[PDB]
Amino acid sequence: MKLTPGCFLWYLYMDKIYCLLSLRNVKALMVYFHLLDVHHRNTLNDVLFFHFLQHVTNLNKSQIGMIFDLLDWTAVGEIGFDQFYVLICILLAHQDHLEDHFMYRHSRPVFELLDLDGEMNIGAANFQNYRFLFNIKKQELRDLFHDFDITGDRLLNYKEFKLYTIFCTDKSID
Amino acid sequence: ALKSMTFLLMLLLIFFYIFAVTGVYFFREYSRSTIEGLEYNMFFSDLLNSLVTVFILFTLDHWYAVLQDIWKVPESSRVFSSIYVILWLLLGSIIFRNIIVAMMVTNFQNIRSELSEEMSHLEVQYKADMFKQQIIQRRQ
């Protein structure tokens, strides 16, 4: 198989969701994970992930720790290879201008990435974590949160978040 | 609620300021009289003492006894002084007590209104939730 059928389907979805499907990007991510995974136990410790992030993205230690805490939903002290590949795809050379629009498109659900709680509501802490991950002004983030909170309960619904993302994509396309 | 204490305490302290500093030199002939038998003379003597005695008048404790002990001053037909202190104590006490209890009951009102609108929004979201669940079940 071409590195399992699930990864092939994920690559097909990425190619259908991005203009450029690159060349052996998933293979490069797998090789980087295998280099990071010293024991080859399909997992990596926090130190290895922090070292890889500092060597590649040159991110801060606190930001790397927050990203590892958000990505590791199982809370077992380790990050899986699939989680590392998902994080690398979420970054996707975030310094580029088109990377901001790609992150605005996000993924197929495009709701659970921001919502760390998982209760179909994104609080202020989740917005602060997203602003730490993706560069955005605090005033701009506050204005966007005020625009999104139509009811005023400081909660973001899945339909409301989808509508906001669709409006942002329509504004950026035009 | 004390965050909502923004301007009411400012008005309270400034009315305290103006009325106390006005009432310093109104019963001036009380401490500065040569009467041997007197025991509330120190109340109206100093500016800090004036603050203390108008705080006492605001708390409204033994105002009858206080006025009876200022009744030892030669009664000049009570034309301005007694009516001034009485109007000050009654107006300040009732107006400020009423305004603070009114502000705090409004604080409770808006706390409960925000709580009620949050539960109403939660119920509306739950209604849309099982409506979309029926839509999903039919779509399969």
PDB file of C-alpha atoms in Angstrom:
ATOM      1  CA  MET A   1       0.000   0.000   0.000  1.00  0.00           C
ATOM      2  CA  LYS A   2       0.969   3.667  -0.406  1.00  0.00           C
ATOM      3  CA  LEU A   3       1.631   4.126   3.327  1.00  0.00           C
ATOM      4  CA  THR A   4      -1.833   2.864   4.442  1.00  0.00           C
ATOM      5  CA  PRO A   5      -5.153   3.740   2.751  1.00  0.00           C
ATOM      6  CA  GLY A   6      -6.165   6.274   5.390  1.00  0.00           C
ATOM      7  CA  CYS A   7      -3.128   8.462   4.742  1.00  0.00           C
ATOM      8  CA  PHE A   8      -3.806   8.164   1.002  1.00  0.00           C
ATOM      9  CA  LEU A   9      -7.381   9.373   1.553  1.00  0.00           C
ATOM     10  CA  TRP A  10      -6.076  12.225   3.720  1.00  0.00           C
ATOM     11  CA  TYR A  11      -3.612  13.188   0.973  1.00  0.00           C
ATOM     12  CA  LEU A  12      -6.436  13.103  -1.586  1.00  0.00           C
ATOM     13  CA  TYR A  13      -8.548  15.364   0.644  1.00  0.00           C
ATOM     14  CA  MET A  14      -5.597  17.745   1.059  1.00  0.00           C
ATOM     15  CA  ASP A  15      -5.073  17.811  -2.719  1.00  0.00           C
ATOM     16  CA  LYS A  16      -8.780  18.538  -3.206  1.00  0.00           C
ATOM     17  CA  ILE A  17      -8.597  21.289  -0.552  1.00  0.00           C
ATOM     18  CA  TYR A  18      -5.316  22.911  -1.677  1.00  0.00           C
ATOM     19  CA  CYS A  19      -4.135  24.244  -5.027  1.00  0.00           C
ATOM     20  CA  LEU A  20      -0.725  22.546  -4.724  1.00  0.00           C
ATOM     21  CA  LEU A  21      -0.407  18.989  -3.406  1.00  0.00           C
ATOM     22  CA  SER A  22       3.427  19.273  -3.251  1.00  0.00           C
ATOM     23  CA  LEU A  23       5.751  16.285  -3.745  1.00  0.00           C
ATOM     24  CA  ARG A  24       6.314  13.681  -0.993  1.00  0.00           C
ATOM     25  CA  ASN A  25       5.208  16.080   1.742  1.00  0.00           C
ATOM     26  CA  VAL A  26       3.615  13.244   3.728  1.00  0.00           C
ATOM     27  CA  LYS A  27       6.747  11.149   3.146  1.00  0.00           C
ATOM     28  CA  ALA A  28       8.928  14.015   4.402  1.00  0.00           C
ATOM     29  CA  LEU A  29       6.717  14.407   7.482  1.00  0.00           C
ATOM     30  CA  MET A  30       6.902  10.656   8.147  1.00  0.00           C
ATOM     31  CA  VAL A  31      10.699  10.705   7.785  1.00  0.00           C
ATOM     32  CA  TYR A  32      10.941  13.677  10.163  1.00  0.00           C
ATOM     33  CA  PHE A  33       8.714  11.875  12.678  1.00  0.00           C
ATOM     34  CA  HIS A  34      10.792   8.687  12.384  1.00  0.00           C
ATOM     35  CA  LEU A  35      13.937  10.735  13.011  1.00  0.00           C
ATOM     36  CA  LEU A  36      12.195  12.358  15.994  1.00  0.00           C
ATOM     37  CA  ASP A  37      10.741   9.058  17.258  1.00  0.00           C
ATOM     38  CA  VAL A  38      13.986   7.540  18.526  1.00  0.00           C
ATOM     39  CA  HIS A  39      12.388   4.364  19.908  1.00  0.00           C
ATOM     40  CA  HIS A  40      10.090   3.963  16.846  1.00  0.00           C
ATOM     41  CA  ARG A  41       7.170   3.293  19.208  1.00  0.00           C
ATOM     42  CA  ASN A  42       4.710   5.369  17.105  1.00  0.00           C
ATOM     43  CA  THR A  43       5.030   8.232  19.607  1.00  0.00           C
ATOM     44  CA  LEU A  44       7.332  11.093  20.565  1.00  0.00           C
ATOM     45  CA  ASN A  45       8.075  12.688  23.918  1.00  0.00           C
ATOM     46  CA  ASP A  46       7.560  16.373  24.674  1.00  0.00           C
ATOM     47  CA  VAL A  47      11.310  17.078  24.556  1.00  0.00           C
ATOM     48  CA  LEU A  48      11.630  15.674  21.025  1.00  0.00           C
ATOM     49  CA  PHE A  49       8.614  17.667  19.811  1.00  0.00           C
ATOM     50  CA  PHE A  50       9.960  20.862  21.398  1.00  0.00           C
ATOM     51  CA  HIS A  51      13.392  20.294  19.834  1.00  0.00           C
ATOM     52  CA  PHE A  52      11.840  19.657  16.409  1.00  0.00           C
ATOM     53  CA  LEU A  53       9.680  22.788  16.686  1.00  0.00           C
ATOM     54  CA  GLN A  54      12.682  24.887  17.743  1.00  0.00           C
ATOM     55  CA  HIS A  55      14.800  23.507  14.889  1.00  0.00           C
ATOM     56  CA  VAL A  56      12.106  23.881  12.205  1.00  0.00           C
ATOM     57  CA  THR A  57       9.704  26.669  13.198  1.00  0.00           C
ATOM     58  CA  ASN A  58      11.926  28.330  15.869  1.00  0.00           C
ATOM     59  CA  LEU A  59       8.885  28.679  18.121  1.00  0.00           C
ATOM     60  CA  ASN A  60       8.997  29.658  21.780  1.00  0.00           C
ATOM     61  CA  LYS A  61       9.166  26.987  24.474  1.00  0.00           C
ATOM     62  CA  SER A  62       5.848  28.085  26.001  1.00  0.00           C
ATOM     63  CA  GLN A  63       4.172  28.158  22.577  1.00  0.00           C
ATOM     64  CA  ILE A  64       5.570  24.706  21.755  1.00  0.00           C
ATOM     65  CA  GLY A  65       4.316  23.369  25.088  1.00  0.00           C
ATOM     66  CA  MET A  66       0.863  24.853  24.500  1.00  0.00           C
ATOM     67  CA  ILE A  67       0.764  23.378  20.981  1.00  0.00           C
ATOM     68  CA  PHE A  68       1.778  19.958  22.327  1.00  0.00           C
ATOM     69  CA  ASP A  69      -0.864  20.180  25.068  1.00  0.00           C
ATOM     70  CA  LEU A  70      -3.556  21.102  22.534  1.00  0.00           C
ATOM     71  CA  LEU A  71      -2.514  18.413  20.040  1.00  0.00           C
ATOM     72  CA  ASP A  72      -2.181  15.596  22.609  1.00  0.00           C
ATOM     73  CA  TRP A  73      -5.844  15.039  23.423  1.00  0.00           C
ATOM     74  CA  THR A  74      -5.172  11.683  25.118  1.00  0.00           C
ATOM     75  CA  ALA A  75      -3.018  13.460  27.767  1.00  0.00           C
ATOM     76  CA  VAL A  76      -0.597  10.521  28.006  1.00  0.00           C
ATOM     77  CA  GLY A  77       2.562  12.651  27.951  1.00  0.00           C
ATOM     78  CA  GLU A  78       3.378  11.766  24.333  1.00  0.00           C
ATOM     79  CA  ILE A  79       2.349  12.915  20.856  1.00  0.00           C
ATOM     80  CA  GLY A  80       1.481  10.383  18.180  1.00  0.00           C
ATOM     81  CA  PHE A  81       2.876  10.342  14.665  1.00  0.00           C
ATOM     82  CA  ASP A  82      -0.575  11.122  13.250  1.00  0.00           C
ATOM     83  CA  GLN A  83      -0.880  14.067  15.654  1.00  0.00           C
ATOM     84  CA  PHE A  84       2.547  15.347  14.574  1.00  0.00           C
ATOM     85  CA  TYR A  85       1.565  15.031  10.902  1.00  0.00           C
ATOM     86  CA  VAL A  86      -1.706  16.866  11.598  1.00  0.00           C
ATOM     87  CA  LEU A  87       0.172  19.668  13.378  1.00  0.00           C
ATOM     88  CA  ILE A  88       2.691  19.925  10.523  1.00  0.00           C
ATOM     89  CA  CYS A  89      -0.167  20.122   8.011  1.00  0.00           C
ATOM     90  CA  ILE A  90      -1.859  22.766  10.179  1.00  0.00           C
ATOM     91  CA  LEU A  91       1.339  24.828  10.101  1.00  0.00           C
ATOM     92  CA  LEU A  92       2.073  24.308   6.368  1.00  0.00           C
ATOM     93  CA  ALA A  93       4.723  27.071   6.243  1.00  0.00           C
ATOM     94  CA  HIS A  94       2.628  29.530   8.240  1.00  0.00           C
ATOM     95  CA  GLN A  95       4.913  32.477   7.393  1.00  0.00           C
ATOM     96  CA  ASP A  96       3.445  32.557   3.870  1.00  0.00           C
ATOM     97  CA  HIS A  97       0.547  34.868   3.044  1.00  0.00           C
ATOM     98  CA  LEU A  98      -1.500  32.051   1.485  1.00  0.00           C
ATOM     99  CA  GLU A  99      -0.999  30.009   4.667  1.00  0.00           C
ATOM    100  CA  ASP A 100      -3.338  32.392   6.513  1.00  0.00           C
ATOM    101  CA  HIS A 101      -6.097  31.701   3.977  1.00  0.00           C
ATOM    102  CA  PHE A 102      -5.326  27.970   4.153  1.00  0.00           C
ATOM    103  CA  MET A 103      -5.704  28.074   7.946  1.00  0.00           C
ATOM    104  CA  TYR A 104      -8.936  30.035   7.465  1.00  0.00           C
ATOM    105  CA  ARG A 105     -10.141  27.125   5.328  1.00  0.00           C
ATOM    106  CA  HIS A 106      -8.844  24.880   8.175  1.00  0.00           C
ATOM    107  CA  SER A 107      -9.970  21.218   7.845  1.00  0.00           C
ATOM    108  CA  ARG A 108     -13.104  19.225   7.021  1.00  0.00           C
ATOM    109  CA  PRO A 109     -14.841  19.851  10.387  1.00  0.00           C
ATOM    110  CA  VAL A 110     -13.049  23.195  10.936  1.00  0.00           C
ATOM    111  CA  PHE A 111     -14.668  23.512  14.371  1.00  0.00           C
ATOM    112  CA  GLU A 112     -12.795  21.249  16.788  1.00  0.00           C
ATOM    113  CA  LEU A 113      -9.336  22.742  16.162  1.00  0.00           C
ATOM    114  CA  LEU A 114     -10.179  25.959  18.017  1.00  0.00           C
ATOM    115  CA  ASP A 115     -12.608  24.310  20.467  1.00  0.00           C
ATOM    116  CA  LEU A 116     -10.238  22.582  22.872  1.00  0.00           C
ATOM    117  CA  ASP A 117     -13.121  21.942  25.287  1.00  0.00           C
ATOM    118  CA  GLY A 118     -15.116  19.959  22.722  1.00  0.00           C
ATOM    119  CA  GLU A 119     -18.519  21.148  24.003  1.00  0.00           C
ATOM    120  CA  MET A 120     -19.360  23.016  20.745  1.00  0.00           C
ATOM    121  CA  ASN A 121     -18.265  26.318  22.296  1.00  0.00           C
ATOM    122  CA  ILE A 122     -14.969  28.210  22.060  1.00  0.00           C
ATOM    123  CA  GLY A 123     -14.101  30.417  25.025  1.00  0.00           C
ATOM    124  CA  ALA A 124     -11.676  33.295  25.420  1.00  0.00           C
ATOM    125  CA  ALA A 125      -8.817  30.956  26.380  1.00  0.00           C
ATOM    126  CA  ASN A 126      -9.242  29.038  23.114  1.00  0.00           C
ATOM    127  CA  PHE A 127      -9.217  32.320  21.173  1.00  0.00           C
ATOM    128  CA  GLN A 128      -6.042  33.385  22.998  1.00  0.00           C
ATOM    129  CA  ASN A 129      -4.423  30.031  22.178  1.00  0.00           C
ATOM    130  CA  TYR A 130      -5.414  30.422  18.515  1.00  0.00           C
ATOM    131  CA  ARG A 131      -3.990  33.960  18.468  1.00  0.00           C
ATOM    132  CA  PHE A 132      -0.781  32.568  19.962  1.00  0.00           C
ATOM    133  CA  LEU A 133      -0.619  29.853  17.289  1.00  0.00           C
ATOM    134  CA  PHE A 134      -1.639  32.116  14.380  1.00  0.00           C
ATOM    135  CA  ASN A 135      -0.477  35.733  14.546  1.00  0.00           C
ATOM    136  CA  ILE A 136      -3.366  38.176  15.008  1.00  0.00           C
ATOM    137  CA  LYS A 137      -3.859  41.503  16.758  1.00  0.00           C
ATOM    138  CA  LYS A 138      -5.523  41.519  20.171  1.00  0.00           C
ATOM    139  CA  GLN A 139      -7.830  44.362  19.107  1.00  0.00           C
ATOM    140  CA  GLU A 140      -8.668  42.517  15.878  1.00  0.00           C
ATOM    141  CA  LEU A 141      -9.330  39.303  17.821  1.00  0.00           C
ATOM    142  CA  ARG A 142     -11.582  41.175  20.265  1.00  0.00           C
ATOM    143  CA  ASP A 143     -13.496  42.795  17.389  1.00  0.00           C
ATOM    144  CA  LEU A 144     -13.920  39.409  15.682  1.00  0.00           C
ATOM    145  CA  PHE A 145     -15.147  37.858  18.944  1.00  0.00           C
ATOM    146  CA  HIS A 146     -17.618  40.724  19.410  1.00  0.00           C
ATOM    147  CA  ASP A 147     -18.855  40.209  15.841  1.00  0.00           C
ATOM    148  CA  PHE A 148     -19.210  36.446  16.355  1.00  0.00           C
ATOM    149  CA  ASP A 149     -21.000  36.690  19.733  1.00  0.00           C
ATOM    150  CA  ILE A 150     -24.405  37.733  18.424  1.00  0.00           C
ATOM    151  CA  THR A 151     -26.235  36.528  21.539  1.00  0.00           C
ATOM    152  CA  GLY A 152     -23.618  38.014  23.870  1.00  0.00           C
ATOM    153  CA  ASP A 153     -22.928  34.835  25.870  1.00  0.00           C
ATOM    154  CA  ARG A 154     -19.251  34.704  24.746  1.00  0.00           C
ATOM    155  CA  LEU A 155     -19.827  31.310  23.107  1.00  0.00           C
ATOM    156  CA  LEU A 156     -19.158  30.303  19.499  1.00  0.00           C
ATOM    157  CA  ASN A 157     -21.557  27.828  17.911  1.00  0.00           C
ATOM    158  CA  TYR A 158     -20.534  25.396  15.181  1.00  0.00           C
ATOM    159  CA  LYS A 159     -22.942  26.998  12.700  1.00  0.00           C
ATOM    160  CA  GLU A 160     -21.835  30.487  13.771  1.00  0.00           C
ATOM    161  CA  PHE A 161     -18.156  29.563  13.387  1.00  0.00           C
ATOM    162  CA  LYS A 162     -18.847  27.992   9.982  1.00  0.00           C
ATOM    163  CA  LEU A 163     -20.727  31.110   8.842  1.00  0.00           C
ATOM    164  CA  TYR A 164     -17.908  33.365  10.072  1.00  0.00           C
ATOM    165  CA  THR A 165     -15.312  31.232   8.267  1.00  0.00           C
ATOM    166  CA  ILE A 166     -17.396  31.266   5.070  1.00  0.00           C
ATOM    167  CA  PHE A 167     -17.753  35.057   5.262  1.00  0.00           C
ATOM    168  CA  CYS A 168     -14.008  35.454   5.871  1.00  0.00           C
ATOM    169  CA  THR A 169     -13.186  33.194   2.913  1.00  0.00           C
ATOM    170  CA  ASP A 170     -15.620  35.117   0.692  1.00  0.00           C
ATOM    171  CA  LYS A 171     -14.091  38.444   1.753  1.00  0.00           C
ATOM    172  CA  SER A 172     -10.539  37.186   1.181  1.00  0.00           C
ATOM    173  CA  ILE A 173     -11.404  35.695  -2.223  1.00  0.00           C
ATOM    174  CA  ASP A 174     -13.003  38.925  -3.471  1.00  0.00           C
TER     175      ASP A 174
ATOM    176  CA  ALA B   1     -21.639  45.687  42.771  1.00  0.00           C
ATOM    177  CA  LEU B   2     -18.703  47.673  44.159  1.00  0.00           C
ATOM    178  CA  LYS B   3     -17.439  47.765  40.585  1.00  0.00           C
ATOM    179  CA  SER B   4     -20.797  49.415  39.881  1.00  0.00           C
ATOM    180  CA  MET B   5     -19.772  51.716  42.750  1.00  0.00           C
ATOM    181  CA  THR B   6     -18.213  54.241  40.389  1.00  0.00           C
ATOM    182  CA  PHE B   7     -20.023  57.566  40.860  1.00  0.00           C
ATOM    183  CA  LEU B   8     -22.403  57.049  43.802  1.00  0.00           C
ATOM    184  CA  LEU B   9     -19.630  56.958  46.409  1.00  0.00           C
ATOM    185  CA  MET B  10     -18.088  60.037  44.776  1.00  0.00           C
ATOM    186  CA  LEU B  11     -21.361  61.930  45.231  1.00  0.00           C
ATOM    187  CA  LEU B  12     -21.651  60.527  48.769  1.00  0.00           C
ATOM    188  CA  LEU B  13     -18.187  61.723  49.793  1.00  0.00           C
ATOM    189  CA  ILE B  14     -18.609  65.090  48.063  1.00  0.00           C
ATOM    190  CA  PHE B  15     -21.943  65.751  49.798  1.00  0.00           C
ATOM    191  CA  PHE B  16     -20.211  64.676  53.018  1.00  0.00           C
ATOM    192  CA  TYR B  17     -17.440  67.174  52.216  1.00  0.00           C
ATOM    193  CA  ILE B  18     -19.684  70.138  51.416  1.00  0.00           C
ATOM    194  CA  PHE B  19     -22.138  69.573  54.279  1.00  0.00           C
ATOM    195  CA  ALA B  20     -19.433  68.941  56.895  1.00  0.00           C
ATOM    196  CA  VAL B  21     -17.379  71.962  55.840  1.00  0.00           C
ATOM    197  CA  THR B  22     -20.579  74.036  55.815  1.00  0.00           C
ATOM    198  CA  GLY B  23     -21.550  72.821  59.291  1.00  0.00           C
ATOM    199  CA  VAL B  24     -18.138  73.546  60.797  1.00  0.00           C
ATOM    200  CA  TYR B  25     -18.901  77.271  61.149  1.00  0.00           C
ATOM    201  CA  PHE B  26     -22.638  77.028  61.837  1.00  0.00           C
ATOM    202  CA  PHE B  27     -22.732  75.802  65.438  1.00  0.00           C
ATOM    203  CA  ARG B  28     -19.483  77.659  66.057  1.00  0.00           C
ATOM    204  CA  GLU B  29     -20.833  79.191  69.278  1.00  0.00           C
ATOM    205  CA  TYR B  30     -21.142  75.689  70.751  1.00  0.00           C
ATOM    206  CA  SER B  31     -17.575  74.633  71.507  1.00  0.00           C
ATOM    207  CA  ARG B  32     -16.485  78.277  71.532  1.00  0.00           C
ATOM    208  CA  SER B  33     -18.835  79.262  74.326  1.00  0.00           C
ATOM    209  CA  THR B  34     -17.832  79.671  77.967  1.00  0.00           C
ATOM    210  CA  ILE B  35     -20.500  77.362  79.441  1.00  0.00           C
ATOM    211  CA  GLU B  36     -19.052  75.199  82.214  1.00  0.00           C
ATOM    212  CA  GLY B  37     -21.599  72.389  82.054  1.00  0.00           C
ATOM    213  CA  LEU B  38     -21.260  70.795  78.619  1.00  0.00           C
ATOM    214  CA  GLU B  39     -20.191  67.378  77.372  1.00  0.00           C
ATOM    215  CA  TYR B  40     -20.731  67.353  73.572  1.00  0.00           C
ATOM    216  CA  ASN B  41     -18.503  70.401  73.003  1.00  0.00           C
ATOM    217  CA  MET B  42     -15.634  68.425  71.449  1.00  0.00           C
ATOM    218  CA  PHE B  43     -17.963  67.211  68.660  1.00  0.00           C
ATOM    219  CA  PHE B  44     -18.071  70.531  66.778  1.00  0.00           C
ATOM    220  CA  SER B  45     -14.607  71.834  67.698  1.00  0.00           C
ATOM    221  CA  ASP B  46     -12.158  70.513  65.102  1.00  0.00           C
ATOM    222  CA  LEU B  47     -12.573  69.876  61.381  1.00  0.00           C
ATOM    223  CA  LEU B  48     -11.818  66.188  61.955  1.00  0.00           C
ATOM    224  CA  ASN B  49     -14.244  66.362  64.880  1.00  0.00           C
ATOM    225  CA  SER B  50     -16.772  67.935  62.510  1.00  0.00           C
ATOM    226  CA  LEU B  51     -16.261  64.967  60.171  1.00  0.00           C
ATOM    227  CA  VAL B  52     -16.788  62.609  63.122  1.00  0.00           C
ATOM    228  CA  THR B  53     -19.987  64.322  64.249  1.00  0.00           C
ATOM    229  CA  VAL B  54     -21.480  64.503  60.750  1.00  0.00           C
ATOM    230  CA  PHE B  55     -20.622  60.809  60.346  1.00  0.00           C
ATOM    231  CA  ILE B  56     -22.571  60.288  63.579  1.00  0.00           C
ATOM    232  CA  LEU B  57     -25.466  62.348  62.193  1.00  0.00           C
ATOM    233  CA  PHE B  58     -25.341  60.286  58.981  1.00  0.00           C
ATOM    234  CA  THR B  59     -25.509  57.084  61.041  1.00  0.00           C
ATOM    235  CA  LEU B  60     -28.383  58.755  62.970  1.00  0.00           C
ATOM    236  CA  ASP B  61     -27.644  57.699  66.550  1.00  0.00           C
ATOM    237  CA  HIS B  62     -28.901  59.878  69.433  1.00  0.00           C
ATOM    238  CA  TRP B  63     -29.728  62.805  67.165  1.00  0.00           C
ATOM    239  CA  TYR B  64     -32.346  63.817  69.748  1.00  0.00           C
ATOM    240  CA  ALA B  65     -29.732  63.803  72.517  1.00  0.00           C
ATOM    241  CA  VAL B  66     -27.272  65.653  70.267  1.00  0.00           C
ATOM    242  CA  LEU B  67     -29.834  68.362  69.479  1.00  0.00           C
ATOM    243  CA  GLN B  68     -30.768  68.604  73.166  1.00  0.00           C
ATOM    244  CA  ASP B  69     -27.083  69.086  74.003  1.00  0.00           C
ATOM    245  CA  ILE B  70     -26.852  71.796  71.322  1.00  0.00           C
ATOM    246  CA  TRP B  71     -30.068  73.216  72.801  1.00  0.00           C
ATOM    247  CA  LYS B  72     -27.795  74.495  75.595  1.00  0.00           C
ATOM    248  CA  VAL B  73     -26.612  77.119  73.085  1.00  0.00           C
ATOM    249  CA  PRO B  74     -28.609  80.386  73.460  1.00  0.00           C
ATOM    250  CA  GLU B  75     -31.665  79.697  71.298  1.00  0.00           C
ATOM    251  CA  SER B  76     -31.629  82.332  68.544  1.00  0.00           C
ATOM    252  CA  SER B  77     -35.158  81.432  67.361  1.00  0.00           C
ATOM    253  CA  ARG B  78     -33.745  78.366  65.496  1.00  0.00           C
ATOM    254  CA  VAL B  79     -34.106  80.240  62.200  1.00  0.00           C
ATOM    255  CA  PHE B  80     -31.198  78.719  60.245  1.00  0.00           C
ATOM    256  CA  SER B  81     -28.983  76.381  62.282  1.00  0.00           C
ATOM    257  CA  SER B  82     -31.351  73.718  63.639  1.00  0.00           C
ATOM    258  CA  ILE B  83     -33.253  73.495  60.356  1.00  0.00           C
ATOM    259  CA  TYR B  84     -29.914  73.172  58.520  1.00  0.00           C
ATOM    260  CA  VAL B  85     -28.620  70.267  60.609  1.00  0.00           C
ATOM    261  CA  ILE B  86     -32.024  68.537  60.630  1.00  0.00           C
ATOM    262  CA  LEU B  87     -32.450  68.875  56.857  1.00  0.00           C
ATOM    263  CA  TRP B  88     -28.875  67.661  56.334  1.00  0.00           C
ATOM    264  CA  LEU B  89     -29.284  64.554  58.495  1.00  0.00           C
ATOM    265  CA  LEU B  90     -32.708  63.570  57.143  1.00  0.00           C
ATOM    266  CA  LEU B  91     -31.986  64.302  53.462  1.00  0.00           C
ATOM    267  CA  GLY B  92     -28.530  62.721  53.422  1.00  0.00           C
ATOM    268  CA  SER B  93     -29.535  59.614  55.367  1.00  0.00           C
ATOM    269  CA  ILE B  94     -32.723  58.793  53.471  1.00  0.00           C
ATOM    270  CA  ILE B  95     -31.434  59.783  50.013  1.00  0.00           C
ATOM    271  CA  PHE B  96     -28.149  57.891  50.240  1.00  0.00           C
ATOM    272  CA  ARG B  97     -29.558  54.785  51.960  1.00  0.00           C
ATOM    273  CA  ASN B  98     -32.321  54.633  49.355  1.00  0.00           C
ATOM    274  CA  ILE B  99     -29.976  55.214  46.414  1.00  0.00           C
ATOM    275  CA  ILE B 100     -27.532  52.494  47.497  1.00  0.00           C
ATOM    276  CA  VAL B 101     -30.258  49.907  48.164  1.00  0.00           C
ATOM    277  CA  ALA B 102     -31.833  50.852  44.810  1.00  0.00           C
ATOM    278  CA  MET B 103     -28.543  50.444  42.954  1.00  0.00           C
ATOM    279  CA  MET B 104     -27.903  47.061  44.555  1.00  0.00           C
ATOM    280  CA  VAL B 105     -31.400  45.729  43.866  1.00  0.00           C
ATOM    281  CA  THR B 106     -30.847  46.850  40.259  1.00  0.00           C
ATOM    282  CA  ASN B 107     -27.551  44.929  40.388  1.00  0.00           C
ATOM    283  CA  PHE B 108     -29.452  41.806  41.449  1.00  0.00           C
ATOM    284  CA  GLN B 109     -32.041  42.542  38.742  1.00  0.00           C
ATOM    285  CA  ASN B 110     -29.456  42.641  35.961  1.00  0.00           C
ATOM    286  CA  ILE B 111     -27.591  39.614  37.370  1.00  0.00           C
ATOM    287  CA  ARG B 112     -30.818  37.606  37.231  1.00  0.00           C
ATOM    288  CA  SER B 113     -31.707  39.065  33.814  1.00  0.00           C
ATOM    289  CA  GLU B 114     -28.339  37.986  32.393  1.00  0.00           C
ATOM    290  CA  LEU B 115     -28.764  34.543  33.977  1.00  0.00           C
ATOM    291  CA  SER B 116     -32.284  34.209  32.542  1.00  0.00           C
ATOM    292  CA  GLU B 117     -31.201  35.258  29.049  1.00  0.00           C
ATOM    293  CA  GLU B 118     -28.307  32.770  29.204  1.00  0.00           C
ATOM    294  CA  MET B 119     -30.660  29.908  30.125  1.00  0.00           C
ATOM    295  CA  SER B 120     -33.136  31.049  27.454  1.00  0.00           C
ATOM    296  CA  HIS B 121     -30.366  31.034  24.837  1.00  0.00           C
ATOM    297  CA  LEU B 122     -29.288  27.584  26.055  1.00  0.00           C
ATOM    298  CA  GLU B 123     -32.853  26.293  25.662  1.00  0.00           C
ATOM    299  CA  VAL B 124     -33.138  27.844  22.183  1.00  0.00           C
ATOM    300  CA  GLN B 125     -29.846  26.197  21.195  1.00  0.00           C
ATOM    301  CA  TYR B 126     -31.120  22.865  22.547  1.00  0.00           C
ATOM    302  CA  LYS B 127     -34.323  23.281  20.504  1.00  0.00           C
ATOM    303  CA  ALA B 128     -32.300  23.890  17.345  1.00  0.00           C
ATOM    304  CA  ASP B 129     -30.138  20.951  18.451  1.00  0.00           C
ATOM    305  CA  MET B 130     -32.789  18.247  18.406  1.00  0.00           C
ATOM    306  CA  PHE B 131     -34.370  19.855  15.338  1.00  0.00           C
ATOM    307  CA  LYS B 132     -31.057  19.421  13.508  1.00  0.00           C
ATOM    308  CA  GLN B 133     -30.806  15.920  15.009  1.00  0.00           C
ATOM    309  CA  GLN B 134     -34.159  15.021  13.429  1.00  0.00           C
ATOM    310  CA  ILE B 135     -32.915  16.582  10.176  1.00  0.00           C
ATOM    311  CA  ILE B 136     -29.749  14.445  10.339  1.00  0.00           C
ATOM    312  CA  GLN B 137     -31.761  11.302  11.139  1.00  0.00           C
ATOM    313  CA  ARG B 138     -34.053  11.905   8.156  1.00  0.00           C
ATOM    314  CA  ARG B 139     -31.083  12.703   5.891  1.00  0.00           C
ATOM    315  CA  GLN B 140     -29.622   9.227   6.496  1.00  0.00           C
TER     316      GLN B 140
END
